[PDB]
Amino acid sequence: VTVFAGPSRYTPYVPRPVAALDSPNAIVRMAKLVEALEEWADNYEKRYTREYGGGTVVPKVAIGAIRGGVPYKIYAFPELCSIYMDIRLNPDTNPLVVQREVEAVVSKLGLKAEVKPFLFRRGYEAQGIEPLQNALEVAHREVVGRPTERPGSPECSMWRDTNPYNELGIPSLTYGCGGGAGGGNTYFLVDDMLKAAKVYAMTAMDLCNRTP
Amino acid sequence: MAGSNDVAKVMKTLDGMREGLIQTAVELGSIEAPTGREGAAGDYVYEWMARNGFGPERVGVFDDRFNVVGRLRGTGGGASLSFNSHLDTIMAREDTARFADANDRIYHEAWHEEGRIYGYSVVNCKGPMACWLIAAKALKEAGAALKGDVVLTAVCGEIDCEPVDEFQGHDYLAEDIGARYAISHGAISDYALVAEATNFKPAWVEAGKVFLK
Numbered sequence A: 001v002t003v004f005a006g007p008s009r010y011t012p013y014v015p016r017p018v019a020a021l022d023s024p025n026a027i028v029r030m031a032k033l034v035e036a037l038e039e040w041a042d043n044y045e046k047r048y049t050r051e052y053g054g055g056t057v058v059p060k061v062a063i064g065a066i067r068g069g070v071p072y073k074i075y076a077f078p079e080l081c082s083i084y085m086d087i088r089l090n091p092d093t094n095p096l097v098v099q100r101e102v103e104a105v106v107s108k109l110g111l112k113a114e115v116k117p118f119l120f121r122r123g124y125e126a127q128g129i130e131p132l133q134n135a136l137e138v139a140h141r142e143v144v145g146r147p148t149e150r151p152g153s154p155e156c157s158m159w160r161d162t163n164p165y166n167e168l169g170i171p172s173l174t175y176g177c178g179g180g181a182g183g184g185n186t187y188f189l190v191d192d193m194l195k196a197a198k199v200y201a202m203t204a205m206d207l208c209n210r211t212p
Numbered sequence B: 001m002a003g004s005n006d007v008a009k010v011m012k013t014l015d016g017m018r019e020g021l022i023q024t025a026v027e028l029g030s031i032e033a034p035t036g037r038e039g040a041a042g043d044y045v046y047e048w049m050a051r052n053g054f055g056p057e058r059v060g061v062f063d064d065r066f067n068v069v070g071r072l073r074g075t076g077g078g079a080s081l082s083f084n085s086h087l088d089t090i091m092a093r094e095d096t097a098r099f100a101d102a103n104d105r106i107y108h109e110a111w112h113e114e115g116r117i118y119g120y121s122v123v124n125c126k127g128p129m130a131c132w133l134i135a136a137k138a139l140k141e142a143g144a145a146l147k148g149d150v151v152l153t154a155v156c157g158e159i160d161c162e163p164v165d166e167f168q169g170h171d172y173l174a175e176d177i178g179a180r181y182a183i184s185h186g187a188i189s190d191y192a193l194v195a196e197a198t199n200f201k202p203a204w205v206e207a208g209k210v211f212l213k
């Protein structure tokens, strides 16, 4: 998202006082936009929360980077400034819908901006997962001792390589020991690791002996 | 002072130098010289000074980013006066991060039209530079009587760029290698007029600065 403003002036000529949204300094305008997008982000995750058989997706938004002007030439403020947004999608949301929502946040502030997607990947719920799900369930109950619990939303609402497998028609789930790094956790119990290896081996001995 | 009508002779001599004045300004202005790459402009000025017998020297921290200092030597016993303008200009090969319109003809060229000379690089600062270059040429060729030296100082890195963080050294330096360096290494005089576009209004106070990260 790149906000435009200007015109740029050598610092001794900068016009003041100016209202933030009217600032010729794109950085100052972007600061207002950031606040409105944060408000949008709070509600976005609520509005696009969605339950699936495979987990509950809570798609979140973060502003992961900002840059405007260059540090080695700061005597004239910039006429444009850019932020880079990470917007998660539930599997049933078209990226364009989200682009429009962000464009609308810009428009309501009365700003001029360019809203450009530079990445789009789809998320997937596995289809026909049951044979792996079952082999895993049986293995898990044996090795770990209780039924599996549904995963927390964050672990259902991220990127994992189950997406490419499911996309390519290979039913795929994610499972392993430990709390999640993104969380974030910092160690594994060796014992848990061994339970994981046994669950994996048993899942294979079940599943790979079923006829496809 | 000044003189008698030693002045009249020099004024007419300058009248006859109108084409040189325009030519110098256009040629200088046409050279690409964003802060960081003032060398070619420096070379132009060095040769211009050499041609006209001002015995220029390159005075620089870097061999491709330097100041140029020449002199019109006086006869003795007078105050010396420096004329000074800078060699660097504003918009680099592509300052798309600062300006949204980083490439218009006016931003990167210079030409004679009507009775005007167009180009940001003329305004800042090749035009004022041409003015005292010509002034000195006239003084010299008119045989003006001057007890004091005139010092001709074309400096690199006037524009407020600065190294910071990972942007260090040669490509990002400016004022540290410009005027103060030139003066500290010989370009001294009793007084100094800095030629910039001020619409004939003289200033003799300026701001300092502190940059904060």
Ligand SMILES: N[C@@]1(O)CC=C([N+](=O)[O-])C=C1C(=O)O
Pocket (backbone or CB within 6 Å): A158, A159, A160, A180, A181, A182, A183
């Ligand atoms: N999907 C990831 O591998 C990518 C990035 C991080 N992270 O931003 O900490 C965490 C992941 C995780 O859930 O392990």
Ligand SMILES: [Zn+2]
Pocket (backbone or CB within 6 Å): B086, B124, B125, B158, B196
């Ligand atoms: Zn200047």
